[PDB]
Amino acid sequence: LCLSQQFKAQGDYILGGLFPLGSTEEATLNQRTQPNSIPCNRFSPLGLFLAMAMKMAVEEINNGSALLPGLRLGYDLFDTCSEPVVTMKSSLMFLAKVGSQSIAAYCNYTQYQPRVLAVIGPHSSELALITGKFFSFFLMPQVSYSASMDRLSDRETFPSFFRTVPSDRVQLQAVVTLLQNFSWNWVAALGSDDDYGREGLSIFSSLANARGICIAHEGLVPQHDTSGQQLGKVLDVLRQVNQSKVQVVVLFASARAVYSLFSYSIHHGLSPKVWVASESWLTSDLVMTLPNIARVGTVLGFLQRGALLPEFSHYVETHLALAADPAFCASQRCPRCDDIMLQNLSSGLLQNLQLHHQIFATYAAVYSVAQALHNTLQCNVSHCHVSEHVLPWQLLENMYNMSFHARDLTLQFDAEGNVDMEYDLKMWVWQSPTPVLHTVGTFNGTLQLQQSKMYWPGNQVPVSQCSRQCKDGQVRRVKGFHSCCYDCVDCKAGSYRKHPDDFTCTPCNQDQWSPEKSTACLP
Amino acid sequence: SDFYLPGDYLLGGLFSLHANMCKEYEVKVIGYNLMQAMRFAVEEINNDSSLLPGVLLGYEIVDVCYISNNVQPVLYFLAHEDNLLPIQEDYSNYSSRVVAVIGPDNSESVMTVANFLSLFLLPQITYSAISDELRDKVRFPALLRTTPSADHHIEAMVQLMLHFRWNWIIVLVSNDTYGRDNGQLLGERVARRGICIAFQETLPTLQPNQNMTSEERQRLVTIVDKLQQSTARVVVVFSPDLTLYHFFNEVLRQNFTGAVWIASESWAIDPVLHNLTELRHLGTFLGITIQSVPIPGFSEFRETCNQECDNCLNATLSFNTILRLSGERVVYSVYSAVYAVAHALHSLLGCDKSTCTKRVVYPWQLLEEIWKVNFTLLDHQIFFDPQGDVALHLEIVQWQWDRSQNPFQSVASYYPLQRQLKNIQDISWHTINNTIPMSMCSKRCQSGQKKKPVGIHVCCFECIDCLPGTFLNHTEDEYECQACPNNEWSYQSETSCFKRQ
CATH class of the missing domain: 2.10.50 (Tumor Necrosis Factor Receptor, subunit A; domain 2)
Incomplete structure (x- = not known):
């Protein structure tokens, strides 16, 4: 096949790209003894579609005149191989001098001549951190699909990182708004053991305090029963869920982990809580296929809403056919990509596409960079002011105030490099034997609810709440992970409420008595 | 100048001289002290004909701000004498200017440098970077430490709480990674040992020489009120030294008194906080830190960009007396790190302790040796764990405000190879009759x-x-x-x- 060569094109300006186009098997992961290169020995199915989407966007931009009239846009694609060393070698190549094999060391780089205009970012968020801290020092603009962590928001460490997908923070803003609307003031919060769940717990634990929601208990939960302890601690988490008498659980984790938890909940029956876990869990088949799952009570979550580009599947099949045709072959970007057949990949995945979202994102990403160049060259309908070669740090000046269009959807980067985007609120309805994801709302910065379309298990609204101040004749006790709620005890007869701010009762003398909830000792 | 010395082989030094262009921020005393530790060590190697006869061990140093000015010095180290760094598939034959890097102190800077150096397997030894993830040799193959991990600091804290039976505590963390994961780690340890954590709160990361807004001040009030109302009289603080200056002032303003404050290594031995006289009235101050090792004569020595510091000398001269009066704790980490590199190079060249066969050294060849060094230095054996740590002892210091003798008195010692706290001594408490201060959720029940x-x-x-x-x-x-x-x-x-x- 010609596929490994199809990932490159010439032009007046060139885009770099980092995609999950390959991987290496476990034997390669051993601690390296010598700085040899990495044998990324096998193909990857998703990266192929991401690369094809980038190619499609660039092809449309070259064919049309809505952007960059009169000049040609090229690209070079590299595989991340999910490996920081390979990612870093590929990243370093982008900054090398024009048409040259080396990179110069200088005190500052607002004086320099790198070989690409912008980088379409890596898939995984950890590689996004690793590569962003490097790229932004060169002030090269890097536009990333995926990579939703809030860490990359801060401009002081990542002055040049942009992304075309909403971050975790806005999703959790929507979640906390859902909690606020139904007065679910007293909740538990859980999260996976990776940085994804770590930052989920952290973001929620900050926003809830900022918005007056008291977390009953935190919790980091294991990925799977990989070791003898993890069969156990999940049950202690569930014991705390029952002891806190919570009804609503927030759970920011991937489906496999939630599936584990769910199965444990099923084993012991638990009780029908409400679960507000993330879309990664709301989407995954292996969860709703649990036969007993209706016992889980109630499932809610926010799912990202986005456009369609229907031409894409036919485009993939077209260029795979061209990759196979020797007449096209007769006319290095990924090794070993050429050895896997067309059919079981194309017909297998294209009939089964959250991975759809990343197509649109990877499309929109290119359209951002091109638009920025279109703005930086100050193009008229007829011509562009390309009398001088633009440098990457110049685009970064414009990218913050632009707006760009993608398939009749319209976008812009905010002051911290995100794009604002909207969600559906989808609840699982399973009075039908097959569980059905069902729309019951929308989030576009404030929560809109279609109250009628929600079927609570008892046909009545669940609640979990806590008293935020006690009455006069009551004794406080603080509760919550941040000491946020109070639970109140009526002070028993024969003792009295010492004073209206105490945490203690006080006995009355032998000769005298006090009513229940009294403040005084009386004849 | 202080920042360069020629030789046959260069070490690369990365030190944080300015806190907050990196020069424009306020200077740090400790950073210049540690830099002097490295310089003194290299001078001693050049004096010692028994270690490297006829070979000039040089050094080149660059100031790296707390989490800024990274990347640039790494490029300066890896680029060759023509200032160009060639891109290659396999670097086995490549020869950087420096042969080893005495890496930054902050964990995030250490990782930012390691993700770069792992590409070349340039050996990197970091003092004081305690983050636990740095034990993951799959992720950080070239990185070693001359200090125990954060695991052992948390274990020391927990065993200190167990010895005095403080089963009811409060934890404060800075609103950054260092506080966040250290609080997570302390909670993970605590739940396993029967101690209870009353609540956890996140401090705002206020700049000490900067004005404070209304909301930040109200946050500080909201935290200290929870401190004042709760029955847990033991407070553990995980924060960088910089942020606490505002917090404690507020604690002083609230008339708070009578708690035991347990400090993490990031501020446990900070002179700048110690010099605040009024902390005496908040209670007892204890802190976990690396052991004290008296260097033989360090004080008498202490008496293309970012290779300079103008303010360092005059700033440090104001602390010089307390610095000399205090012990030498992290200075030993820097000193032993340079000695580790020196021994590794000494054995790699195969020098016979009379003459050395000078040779082109590829960094990975030295990295594979730095794991096998095992030697005495000031009566301590230093050798590296398979995961990369030197098992130096930790000690617990009580803050003492008699300016005449010593600011940080050791009251205990901790052995990480045995994972045990030992040699607990006569702490002097704030209590009315020196009786051990007490915190418990509720008092032990009657019989029956x-x-x-x-x-x-x-x-x-x-x-x-x-x-x-x-x-x-x-x-x-x-x-x-x-x-x-x-x-x-x-x-x-x-x-x-x-x-x-």
Whole structure:
């Protein structure tokens, strides 16, 4: 096949790209003894579609005149191989001098001549951190699909990182708004053991305090029963869920982990809580296929809403056919990509596409960079002011105030490099034997609810709440992970409420008595 | 100047001289002290003909701000004498200017440098970067440390709490990664040992020489109020030194008193905080830190960009007396790191202790040797764990404000190879008769009086009398009363039954 060569094109300006186009098997992961290169020995199915989407966007931009009239846009694609060393070698190549094999060391780089205009970012968020801290020092603009962590928001460490997908923070803003609307003031919060769940717990634990929601208990939960302890601690988490008498659980984790938890909940029956876990869990088949799952009570979550580009599947099949045709072959970007057949990949995945979202994102990403160049060259309908070669740090000046269009959807980067985007609120309805994801709302910065379309298990609204101040004749006790709620005890007869701010009762003398909830000792 | 010395082989030094262009921020005393530690070590190697005869061990140094000015010095180190760094598939034959890097202090800077150096396997030794993830040699193959991990600091804190029976505590963390994960780690340890954590709060990361807004001030009030109202009189603080200057002032403003403050290594031995006289009135200050090792004569020595510091000398001269009066703790980490590189190079060149066969050294060849060094330096053996740590002892320092003798008195020692706290000494408390200060959720119950838990926290319980005809078999249960055998009866709250008609 010609596929490994199809990932490159010439032009007046060139885009770099980092995609999950390959991987290496476990034997390669051993601690390296010598700085040899990495044998990324096998193909990857998703990266192929991401690369094809980038190619499609660039092809449309070259064919049309809505952007960059009169000049040609090229690209070079590299595989991340999910490996920081390979990612870093590929990243370093982008900054090398024009048409040259080396990179110069200088005190500052607002004086320099790198070989690409912008980088379409890596898939995984950890590689996004690793590569962003490097790229932004060169002030090269890097536009990333995926990579939703809030860490990359801060401009002081990542002055040049942009992304075309909403971050975790806005999703959790929507979640906390859902909690606020139904007065679910007293909740538990859980999260996976990776940085994804770590930052989920952290973001929620900050926003809830900022918005007056008291977390009953935190919790980091294991990925799977990989070791003898993890069969156990999940049950202690569930014991705390029952002891806190919570009804609503927030759970920011991937489906496999939630599936584990769910199965444990099923084993012991638990009780029908409400679960507000993330879309990664709301989407995954292996969860709703649990036969007993209706016992889980109630499932809610926010799912990202986005456009369609229907031409894409036919485009993939077209260029795979061209990759196979020797007449096209007769006319290095990924090794070993050429050895896997067309059919079981194309017909297998294209009939089964959250991975759809990343197509649109990877499309929109290119359209951002091109638009920025279109703005930086100050193009008229007829011509562009390309009398001088633009440098990457110049685009970064414009990218913050632009707006760009993608398939009749319209976008812009905010002051911290995100794009604002909207969600559906989808609840699982399973009075039908097959569980059905069902729309019951929308989030576009404030929560809109279609109250009628929600079927609570008892046909009545669940609640979990806590008293935020006690009455006069009551004794406080603080509760919550941040000491946020109070639970109140009526002070028993024969003792009295010492004073209206105490945490203690006080006995009355032998000769005298006090009513229940009294403040005084009386004849 | 202080920042360069030629030689046959260069070390690369990365030190944080300015806190907050990196030069424009306020200077740090400790950073210049550590830089002098490295310089003195290299001078000694050049004096010592027994270690590297006829070979000039040089050094080149660059200031790296707290989490800024990274990347640039790494490029300066890896680029060749023509200032160009060539891109290659395989770097086995490549020869950087420096042969080793004495890496940054902050963990995030250390990782930012490691993700770069792992590409070339340039050996990197970091002092004081305690983050636990740095043990992952799959992720950081070229990185070693001359200090124990954060695991051992948390273990020292927990065993200190166990010794004095402080099963009811409060934890404060800075609103950044260092605070966040250290609080997570302390919670993970605590839940396993029967200690209870009253609550956890996140401090705002206020700049010490900067004005404070209304909301930040109200946040500080909201935290210190929870401190004042809660029964837990032990407070553990995980924060960079910089942020705390504002916090404690507010604590002083609130008339707060009588707590035991447990400090993490990031501020446990900071002179700048110690010099605040009024901290005496907040209670007892304890902190976990690396051991003290007296260098032989360090004080008499202490008397293309970012390779300069103008303010360092005059700033440090104001602290010089307390610095000399204090011990040498992290200075030993820097000193032993340079000595580790020196021994590794000494054996790699195969020098015979009379003459050395000078050779082109590829960094990975030195990295594979730095793991096998095992030697005495000031009576301590230094050798590296398979995961990369040198197992230096930790010590617990009480803050003392008599300016005449010593600011940080060691009251305990901690052995990480044995994972045990030992040699606890006469701490002098704030209490009225020097009796050990106490924090517990609720006091131990009477005999014959069963427990009933009050909440999530295992430590908290009501005590309920067993009704007559039942007794509390203290040896077999705690939360219910056995019924007396039918031939016997019981006087309400009692552990036993009596024969009766």
